[PDB]
Amino acid sequence: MMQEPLTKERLISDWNSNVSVAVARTTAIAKSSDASLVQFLAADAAATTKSTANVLKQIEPLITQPAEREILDKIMQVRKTYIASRDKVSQLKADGMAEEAESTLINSYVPAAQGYLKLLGELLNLQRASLDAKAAEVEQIE
Amino acid sequence: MQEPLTKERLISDWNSNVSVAVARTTAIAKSSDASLVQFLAADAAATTKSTANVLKQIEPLITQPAEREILDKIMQVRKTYIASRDKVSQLKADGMAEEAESTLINSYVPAAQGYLKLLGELLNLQRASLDAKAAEVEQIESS
């Protein structure tokens, strides 16, 4: 019972950490004049990506509420926009197109990452609220 | 239940901050751009302040021998981690790219790995306590 929202809270926390890491890395890539940084960080980026893939596969079978499914649907859509803009920033920086990379970071990547993190926060708060309610019942009702 | 849950959430935020800082410092050390240090200074300071606030909240809640022992070890290694992080940033800002990369590999990465390993152990202490309590609840409700 309780372990359901507990497990989902932990998985979503890992996911949120992965996105925060990826945002810091993409920000550093976009602000560095070094066109080679993308390739230097490719292995780290791949580890972050695969970590999130693992989280997603674990979260999917645990989704039990319509609200969770709607939020997750929105997350996956926003995530598509985020991935496209992240990849565009990396491509432009690798090609030395610093100005266009900045335009993309500001107009596309930042809003997508912010929406991504906001929706992850909503799903996380959903789990935390369910778990907090059950924990309060267990403590008080005893 | 609320005690280990609060600690688990605070430690999760802490761990996220450390992972972000490690990614940022790695990017700084691998970039040929000496200016990245200054460009990311505000973000790095915000990560630092976030962890400081987490520590202020978690310290009074860490009361039992095992968690206190792990926390003491974390703070010890964290001293080395901070020193090496600051060294990496300083060498990069000073144009000592080669020395900054060497410091990243020989000093910063080992400290960061020990820091993250001990944070993971503290987090797992909280998670194991919560798992045990939740399982006890499921047992009671099953009878």
The residue extents of the domains of chain B are 1-143
Q: A110-122 b/e with 16+ CB inside 10 Å = b?
A: bebbebbbebbee
- Angstroms from B124 CA to nearest CA on chain A: 11
Sign of CA dihedral A86, A113, A6, B56: positive
DSSP character for B33? -
- Angstroms from A116 CA to nearest CA on chain B: 16
Q: Can you list the alpha helix ranges (DSSP code H) found in chain B?
A: 2-30, 36-39, 41-58, 65-93, 97-103, 109-142
Pick the closest to residue B27 from A114, A45, A82 (CA basis). A45
As given in the structure block, the two tokens for residue B74 are: 């974390």
Question: What Å resolution does this PDB entry report?
Answer: 1.8
Quick check: A139 and B1 CB within 8 A?
A: yes
Radius of gyration of chain A (CA): 18
d(CA A55, CA B109): 25
Pick the closest to residue B5 from A67, A122, A60, A13 (CA basis). A13
Pick the closest to residue A123 from A3, A9, A4, A6 (CA basis). A9
Chain B residues with CB inside 8 Å of A13's CB?
Answer: 9, 12, 16
As given in the structure block, the two tokens for residue A5 are: 């929202």
Pick the closest to residue A59 from A68, A50, A67, A46 (CA basis). A68
Phi and psi (nearest 5°) for A35? -65, -20
Collect all residues from B whose CB is shorter than 8 A from any CB in A. Answer: 1-2, 5, 9, 12, 15-16, 19-20, 23-24, 26-28, 30-33, 35-36, 39-40, 43, 127, 130-131, 133-135, 137-138, 141
Distance of CA A105 to the CA centre of its chain: 16
Q: Centre a 10 Å sphere on the Cβ of residue B20 and count the other Cβ atoms it contains.
A: 23
Q: Which residue of B has its CA nearest to A11?
A: B12
- Angstroms from B69 CA to nearest CA on chain A: 24
**Which whole-number Å values give the CA distances from A6 to B4, B43, B90, B118, in the listed order?**
12, 30, 42, 22
Q: Which residue of A has its CA nearest to B141?
A: A1
- Angstroms from A44 CA to nearest CA on chain B: 8
Sign of CA dihedral B79, A47, B117, B124: positive
Q: How many contacts, defined by CB atoms under 8 Å, are there between A and B?
A: 90
DSSP string over B71-109: HHHHHHHHHHHHHHHHHHHHHHHTT-HHHHHHHIIIIIH
